[PDB]
Amino acid sequence: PSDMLYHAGISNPDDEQEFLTVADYEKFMQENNLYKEGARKIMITGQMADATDLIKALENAGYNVYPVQSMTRFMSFIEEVQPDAVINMAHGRMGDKMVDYLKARNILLFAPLTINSLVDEWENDPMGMSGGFMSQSIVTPEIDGAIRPFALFAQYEDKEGLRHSYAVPERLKTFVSTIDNYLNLKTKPNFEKKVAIYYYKGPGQNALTAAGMEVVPSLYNLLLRMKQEGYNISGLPANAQELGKMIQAQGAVFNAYAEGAFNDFMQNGHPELITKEQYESWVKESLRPEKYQEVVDAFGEFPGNYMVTPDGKLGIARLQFGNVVLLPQNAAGSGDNSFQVVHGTDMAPPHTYIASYLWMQHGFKADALIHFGTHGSLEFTPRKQVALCSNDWPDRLVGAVPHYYLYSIGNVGEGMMAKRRSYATLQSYLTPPFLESSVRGIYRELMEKIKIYNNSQKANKDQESLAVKTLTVKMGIHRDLGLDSMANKPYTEDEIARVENFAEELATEKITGQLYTMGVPYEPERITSSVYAMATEPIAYSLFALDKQRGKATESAEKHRSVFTQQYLMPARLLVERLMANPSLATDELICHTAGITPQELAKARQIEAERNYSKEEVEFALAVAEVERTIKNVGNYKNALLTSPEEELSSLMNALKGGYTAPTPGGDPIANPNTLPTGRNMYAINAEATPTESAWEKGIALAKQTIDRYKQRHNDSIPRKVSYTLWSSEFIETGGATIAQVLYMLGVEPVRDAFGRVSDLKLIPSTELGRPRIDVVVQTSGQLRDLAASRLFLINRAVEMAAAAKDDKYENQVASSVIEAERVLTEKGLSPKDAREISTFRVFGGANGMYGTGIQEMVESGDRWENESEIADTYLNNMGAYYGSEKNWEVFQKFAFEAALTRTDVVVQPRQSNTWGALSLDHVYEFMGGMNLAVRNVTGKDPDAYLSDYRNRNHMKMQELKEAVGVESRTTILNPTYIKEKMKGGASSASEFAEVITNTYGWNVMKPAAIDKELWDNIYNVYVKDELNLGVKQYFEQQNPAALEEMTAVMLESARKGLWQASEEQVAELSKLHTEIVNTYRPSCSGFVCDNAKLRDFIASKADAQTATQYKENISKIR
Ligand code: NA
Ligand code: NA
């Protein structure tokens, strides 16, 4: 039978009993005393493995089990039985009917995994799963809302030599305990549950941080909501300021060198004390001997050296209110100050990390674990990628406790690691609101001069050009665009057009305002501005495309930005305002009049759109029409969702804590994807076996052509010899694989799709069709991308090998030349000819030992531990020299392999997809891009070009230069009074952003000196040290967060000391005076720059007064 219920025989377990109706199975259970009155029911579906032991264990635990085998019509059994949970050995997806039933009934769905090998082989595999098997076992079920991808089943051999599937005995106990823990949340009273919450805090006196969120008020609101719901919370303070003071007093973390600080904390913070017996019992119960032996080898015997009493106990910092506990997250590594990774050894966490998590599991005996914000570091510990075993740290540290994780909708790429490696359930929260830059009144007279120039009918237009040039040079714009500043040499038409486009881009930039607090909606003005930002550009660009396709005079609007603003942006804004005033105007006649189409054309477009869910022009016309229709229709829904989301977040969190079901959702910020509202849902990703999709291919081709055209324009019509790429995960998920398309088109290879839409083969483009020589590529990746899509790397390497062997080309083949040069370089280094020939084709690289980052930020920000950039280049070459181009040579390190592949490199490309961060507001951007740039400059001896792929506007993707982007970001955010005044209405979390931006600016100046000017440092000094805008920022920093001001002053002084900034004596004196005054008044914060840099300390002391210097030195020496 194909649809049945099954069970194992009682007298004879070998043969199987089959039943066609639920009544027969119930009678069979009652005959054999398998039925218990009032017990909860569990249904088991699937065919991937043999589940006899699981059924027996669940029955012994005290449940009623229904094993159902039905591939298609399994909903009838579920509706007849009405279980309390569903366990699925998934192969594919179940459908929307299951999601509707789960939402209606509010029950859970689980999905364990199966391994098709022996246990010994599985425990030694560094990957676990990859490809179609991983897509069918993990990726697809997440679209239904499954949780806990736990590895349970494996295979064994008998005497004859036959493979048999079974369940590993050690995993079964943990799985059953987890099921019991999840089911007990529904019946236990709220007054008796115990909850643990984890937050992230900076060292010393720094503030709490999360991605775009104000942390302390959100925590206070959450605690108030929990107290209202009926939980046992006592001792809560009056307001959030008192909570912040208490957290600072009793919840701080310290670095290794600040012995005095935590020695003082031991006698004032009242921490939890752990003895040796408890720790040893917990370790024996939880971990394995070999991993603990590794920990002992790395750090020594218990308790270690960090926060230990003289008696021999360990101290844990926590803050407890009744049955709720708050804890900070410690460091997952060691401050050995050795920046080069040793190949062949992993990193084990110190004693404090393990002690905290084991005390949560066994000492506090928590019923629920919560991670508060984006993002922690638990899910980035070693070793395996997916399908973890008992040797992996996240699996052991999480245990069998329900796990919830608060995450932002703008960082979908990194949530998959938390979902798949720590078994967490994600809860989405919003992003900060958007507004206009309001800088149109500063660059107005320049626009008037340009307008006067454009309307001159004179044959000789030079004086107007001279006036425009004078105004441009006065404002310093010529440095951003790479123009000249000669006395009597007028500009040409193209340069003036570039200046006008730059100014218009400045005028229409969107910025973020005050940070987001849970339980508090935006201001009505911010609601209006966000709804304005979410709807204007789609309508404008779709109308422009529709006008272009019909053959209208769109050349002027495509050539100038002012014309486009005056012809397509203002009418869209007016229409959006009208629709926002009265949502009932959205009629088909309005659509047909706005798009200038007849109703029959609209019907045809709707028919085409429905069929796709014809020639190419019809398809694109229908797509534009559908975009216009959706954007017009959903304005009121946007506003309502924005107004209603904050309450839904708290309600969903409470429902999840009571053991309910959380609905799935996609990811992305509201501007890029409006389908992410309302929030409070669980995010999923795309299938990597179908990438690059049909839509991403054309965009990749266009971007590659734009890159080639720009390089030819800047270098006298010469094409590049080799191009470098960096691959990340979020843009891969949100674009469909456009960067891979760019790489493949640069090589000259195209994908081949089967009948199911999966890409599994490659084809060579003829040289005549290409119209240009082939160009070689080199690629670097991050850990998240390697986890998400590993087969695409194999495709890329295979494409490189295929293109290197193409002969009889009309144009030159540069891939073969690159291979020959790499082989020669390897030969001159002292390698065997066979090894050199084998290695001369490696082109995909990543972090050593499988780490997720580059490890270069720690070396750059330790200014007193290096002198030249060559040391940084060597460290970067060592730390990112592993190879990930094939499965048989997965994670193999060869000396000089990375260096030989970087020869003859001309361009560096970095993707960008989010509207919330830029080049100066994210540290990973400089960490990767500037590191690659520095390595290329050190290897080849010439500084390459740097470009950014702008995906932010899904209807208009483009390519931009790095220095222009830096200029735009600097002119729009940190030197803009509107941004500063909007930020000055927050707290400490808002105040940390300035220090973060200054640190990133210092890092960029270190990596690529030519991209940072002295005038930028001068402007920052004028704004933040002299207060030329008359905003009163010093008082704001004093009343909110002095540590940020200390950090900013220290960073500027370090830049002055290293020679990167050519400051004068007065500026140095003022900075030193301010730094010493703040440190003396408000005590040191002790970050890396302030309390761990001797040369900077001496430099600061030498520039100040003698008594002030002595007081500053004695203040510094107290913490060490
Ligand atoms: Na940093
Ligand atoms: Na990060």
- From 458, 507, 498, 456, select the one nearest 480 (Cα to Cα): 498
Please tell me the total number of residues recorded for the chain in this structure.
1120
CA distances to 193, 400, 684, 968 from 173, rounded to whole Å, are 23, 10, 29, 58
CB atoms within 10 A of CB 1026: 10
Contacts for 206 with CB less than 8 Å, ≥ 6 apart:
992, 1043, 1085, 1087
Token pair of 12 as six digits: 């004879």
Strands 434-436 and 510-512: antiparallel
Token pair of 347 as six digits: 């990193």
DSSP string, 1075-1096: HHHHHHHH-----HHHHS-HHH
- CATH level 3 topology of 3-184: Rossmann fold (3.40.50)
What are the backbone dihedrals phi and psi of residue 513, each rounded to the nearest 5 degrees, phi first?
-105, -130
CB 964 within 8 A of CB 950: no
Q: Dihedral of CA 615/620/625/626: which sign?
A: positive
CB 536 within 8 A of CB 569: yes
Amino acid identity at 282:
W
CB 427 within 8 A of CB 662: yes
Task: For tokens 């959702």, name the residue.
Answer: 665
Q: Dihedral of CA 709/710/713/717: which sign?
A: negative
Torsion of CA 771, 773, 778, 782, to 10 degrees: 0
CB 599 within 8 A of CB 562: no
- Between the CA of 192 and the centroid of ligand 2 the distance, in Å, is 36
CB 131 within 8 A of CB 109: no
Token pair of 652 as six digits: 């969903």
What are the backbone dihedrals phi and psi of residue 251, each rounded to the nearest 5 degrees, phi first?
-140, 35
- From 524, 425, 478, select the one nearest 149 (Cα to Cα): 425
- Between the CA of 962 and the centroid of ligand 1 the distance, in Å, is 20
Ligand that comes closest to the CA of residue 379? 2
Ligand that comes closest to the CA of residue 861? 1
Task: For tokens 């009993």, name the residue.
Answer: 17
- Between the CA of 212 and the centroid of ligand 2 the distance, in Å, is 13
- Between the CA of 382 and the centroid of ligand 2 the distance, in Å, is 17
What are the backbone dihedrals phi and psi of residue 312, each rounded to the nearest 5 degrees, phi first?
110, 35
- The greatest distance separating any two alpha carbons of the chain, rounded to the nearest whole angstrom, comes to 106
- Between the CA of 999 and the centroid of ligand 1 the distance, in Å, is 7
| 3-state DSSP assignment of residue 817 | helix
- From 7, 52, 71, select the one nearest 34 (Cα to Cα): 7
Torsion of CA 203, 209, 211, 214, to 10 degrees: -170
CB atoms within 10 A of CB 519: 15
Amino acid identity at 93:
R
DSSP string, 849-901: GG-SS---HHHHT-GGG--SHHHHHHHHHHHT-EE-S-STTTTEE-TTHHHHH
Task: Please report the beta strands in 634-758, taking only residues with DSSP state E, as ranges in sequence order.
Answer: 664-665, 682-683, 722-727, 749-753
CB 195 within 8 A of CB 495: no
- From 362, 321, 323, select the one nearest 191 (Cα to Cα): 323
| First-to-final CA distance of the chain | 75
Token pair of 204 as six digits: 């010393």
Token pair of 544 as six digits: 């422009």
- Between the CA of 923 and the centroid of ligand 1 the distance, in Å, is 6
DSSP 8-state assignment for residue 636: H
Contacts for 341 with CB less than 8 Å, ≥ 6 apart:
848, 849, 851, 855, 878, 879
State which H helix or E strand residue 1113 sits in: helix 1106-1117
Ligand that comes closest to the CA of residue 211? 2
- Between the CA of 941 and the centroid of ligand 1 the distance, in Å, is 27
Residue 769 class from Cβ within 10 Å (0-12 exposed, 13-18 middle, 19+ buried)?
exposed
Ligand that comes closest to the CA of residue 380? 2
* 903-918: b (≥16 Cβ within 10 Å) or e: bbbbbbbbbbbbbbbb
Q: Dihedral of CA 36/41/46/50: which sign?
A: negative
- From 963, 945, 955, 954, select the one nearest 707 (Cα to Cα): 945
Angle, CA of 524, 526 and 532, to the nearest 5°: 105
**Measured between alpha carbons, how far is 819 from 840 in angstroms, rounded to an integer?**
6
Residues facing 68 on adjacent strands: 5, 45
CB atoms within 10 A of CB 1007: 22
- Between the CA of 860 and the centroid of ligand 1 the distance, in Å, is 9
**Measured between alpha carbons, how far is 438 from 693 in angstroms, rounded to an integer?**
39
- Between the CA of 378 and the centroid of ligand 2 the distance, in Å, is 13
Token pair of 730 as six digits: 């979020």
DSSP string, 438-494: --TTTSHHHHHHHHHHHT---S---HHHHHHHHHHHHHTHHHHHT----SS----HH
Alpha carbon 422 to chain centroid, angstroms: 17
Task: For tokens 């809560």, name the residue.
Answer: 236
- Between the CA of 917 and the centroid of ligand 2 the distance, in Å, is 12
Which region, left, alpha or beta, applies to residue 519 given φ > 0 means left and ψ of -120 to 50 means alpha?
A: left
**Measured between alpha carbons, how far is 659 from 661 in angstroms, rounded to an integer?**
7
**Measured between alpha carbons, how far is 1091 from 202 in angstroms, rounded to an integer?**
14
**Measured between alpha carbons, how far is 944 from 907 in angstroms, rounded to an integer?**
5
- Between the CA of 603 and the centroid of ligand 1 the distance, in Å, is 55
CB atoms within 10 A of CB 476: 15
Ligand that comes closest to the CA of residue 852? 2
- Between the CA of 1018 and the centroid of ligand 2 the distance, in Å, is 30
- Between the CA of 53 and the centroid of ligand 2 the distance, in Å, is 42
CB 995 within 8 A of CB 1044: yes
CA distances to 468, 474, 488, 525, 1013 from 485, rounded to whole Å, are 12, 10, 9, 42, 16
SS (H, E, C) 234-291: CCCCCCHHHHHHHHHHHCCCCCCCCHHHHHHHHCCCCCEEECHHHHHHHHHHHCCHHH
- Between the CA of 988 and the centroid of ligand 2 the distance, in Å, is 20
- Between the CA of 919 and the centroid of ligand 1 the distance, in Å, is 14
- Between the CA of 972 and the centroid of ligand 1 the distance, in Å, is 23
Token pair of 634 as six digits: 């959903």
Token pair of 1084 as six digits: 């040191």
SS (H, E, C) 952-967: EECCEEEEEEHHHHHH
CB 85 within 8 A of CB 110: yes
- From 49, 71, 374, select the one nearest 198 (Cα to Cα): 374
Which region, left, alpha or beta, applies to residue 1059 given φ > 0 means left and ψ of -120 to 50 means alpha?
A: left
- From 778, 775, 776, 774, select the one nearest 724 (Cα to Cα): 778
Token pair of 968 as six digits: 């735009």
Ligand that comes closest to the CA of residue 377? 2
- From 131, 173, 125, 183, select the one nearest 152 (Cα to Cα): 173
Ligand that comes closest to the CA of residue 927? 1
91 is in an annotated binding site: yes
**Measured between alpha carbons, how far is 947 from 966 in angstroms, rounded to an integer?**
12
What are the backbone dihedrals phi and psi of residue 830, each rounded to the nearest 5 degrees, phi first?
100, 45
Ligand that comes closest to the CA of residue 413? 2
CA distances to 191, 237, 371, 520, 649 from 227, rounded to whole Å, are 10, 12, 19, 18, 17
Torsion of CA 710, 711, 717, 719, to 10 degrees: -130
Tell me the domain boundaries of the chain.
Answer: 3-184, 190-434, 440-508, 534-633, 703-962, 976-1117
Which region, left, alpha or beta, applies to residue 748 given φ > 0 means left and ψ of -120 to 50 means alpha?
A: left
CB atoms within 10 A of CB 85: 18
- Between the CA of 881 and the centroid of ligand 1 the distance, in Å, is 22
**Measured between alpha carbons, how far is 134 from 788 in angstroms, rounded to an integer?**
10
**Measured between alpha carbons, how far is 686 from 788 in angstroms, rounded to an integer?**
10
Q: What is the resolution of this structure in A?
A: 2.5
Amino acid identity at 1018:
D
**Measured between alpha carbons, how far is 698 from 693 in angstroms, rounded to an integer?**
10
- Between the CA of 1048 and the centroid of ligand 1 the distance, in Å, is 13
**Measured between alpha carbons, how far is 520 from 238 in angstroms, rounded to an integer?**
18
**Measured between alpha carbons, how far is 265 from 253 in angstroms, rounded to an integer?**
10
Residue 604 class from Cβ within 10 Å (0-12 exposed, 13-18 middle, 19+ buried)?
middle
- Between the CA of 211 and the centroid of ligand 1 the distance, in Å, is 15
Ligand that comes closest to the CA of residue 1002? 1
Residue 22 class from Cβ within 10 Å (0-12 exposed, 13-18 middle, 19+ buried)?
middle
Ligand that comes closest to the CA of residue 202? 1
Ligand that comes closest to the CA of residue 997? 1
Task: For tokens 């004693």, name the residue.
Answer: 351
User: H helices then E strands: how many in the chain?
Assistant: 50, 31
- Between the CA of 1084 and the centroid of ligand 2 the distance, in Å, is 27
- From 838, 845, 812, 807, select the one nearest 823 (Cα to Cα): 838
CB 343 within 8 A of CB 880: no
| 3-state DSSP assignment of residue 151 | strand
Alpha carbon 449 to chain centroid, angstroms: 43
CA distances to 448, 677, 900, 994, 1060 from 1024, rounded to whole Å, are 31, 38, 45, 10, 19
CB 1080 within 8 A of CB 1088: no
- Between the CA of 996 and the centroid of ligand 1 the distance, in Å, is 8
- Between the CA of 127 and the centroid of ligand 1 the distance, in Å, is 30
SS (H, E, C) 730-749: HHHHHHCCHHHHHHHHHHCE
Residues facing 325 on adjacent strands: 196, 320
Ligand that comes closest to the CA of residue 860? 1
**Measured between alpha carbons, how far is 610 from 898 in angstroms, rounded to an integer?**
50
CB 1009 within 8 A of CB 943: no
Amino acid identity at 952:
R
Query: Which residues have CB less than 5 Å away from ligand 1 (the ion)?
Result: 857, 923
Give CB contacts under 8 A, 24+ apart, made by 834-843.
839/894, 839/897, 839/900, 840/900, 841/797, 841/800, 841/801, 841/804, 842/883, 842/885, 842/894, 842/897, 842/901, 843/777, 843/778, 843/779, 843/796, 843/797, 843/800, 843/885, 843/901
Contacts for 335 with CB less than 8 Å, ≥ 6 apart:
255, 256, 257
State which H helix or E strand residue 1018 sits in: helix 1014-1025
